[PDB]
Amino acid sequence: ITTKTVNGVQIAFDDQGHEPGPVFVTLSGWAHDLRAYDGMLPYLRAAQRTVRVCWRGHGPDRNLVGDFGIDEMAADTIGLLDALEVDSFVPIAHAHGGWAALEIADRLGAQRVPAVMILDLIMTPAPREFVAALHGIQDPERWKEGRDGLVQSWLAGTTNQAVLDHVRYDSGGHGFDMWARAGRVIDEAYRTWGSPMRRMEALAEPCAIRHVFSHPKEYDALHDDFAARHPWFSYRRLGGETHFPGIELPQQVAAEAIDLLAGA
Secondary structure (H helix, E strand, O other): OOEEEOOOEEEEEEEEEEOOOOOOEEEOOHHHHHHHHHHOOHHHHHOOOOOOOOOOOOOOOOOOOOOOOHHHHHHHHHHHHHOOOOEEEEEEEEEEHHHHHHHHHHHHOOOOOOOEEEOOOOOOOOOHHHHHHHOOOOOOOOOOHHHHHHHHHHHHOOOHHHHHHHHHOOOOOHHHHHHHHHHHHHHHHHHHHHHHHHHHHOOOOOOOOEEEEOOOOOOHHHHHHHHHHHEEEEEEEEOOOOHHHHHHHHHHHHHHHHHHHHHO
């Protein structure tokens, strides 16, 4: 694991592979790091240069950082990719990392970012149960309750050892400060855009987006309708038990990313 100072903050990352073409850039969700992509990584790096990126405050340095959100996540990873002289690249973002993935796509254009894959991101407007949990993890006294309740629904009774180990053992060293911030940023993201589908339609020059998921349940039909209206959009339900398709089904998700890049 290596680090750079980007925008005055410490960004940890991983740089593997030398195949030519667009670079895979992995972006995790809130309160976990590039180990979310340990399963996919052998397949990704065999295919393309692969850069796994941590968010600010998520690297080995677990000091509390200044408050930040989606605009900073985007500017940090862009500044990192500029420093690494990465040209065109394809973000792979887990759940609400997709908000930053889309902000990055929107900032650089379709030629510098020709595709984006998103993993298990709520595509409807935010359910009220969700918003309720986004406020419970902002609760100093009961943020742990909120997390366990989010986690338990993310697992959905799974037996997949990789997903179990990642949630139980591989996301330590975070607390109220980061979980409350995730509550703040995810809540404000739905409040501002309505939904990530609305977020996508606001892209001036939409690149190729693919949403890969196992958890929403409502509707694939909302996806069919979105794909039928926008040729740049695709999607695939994976059939996994969990909220973590990249960890539960790493080869299949990698195959999807390699497919998405091939098309674009």
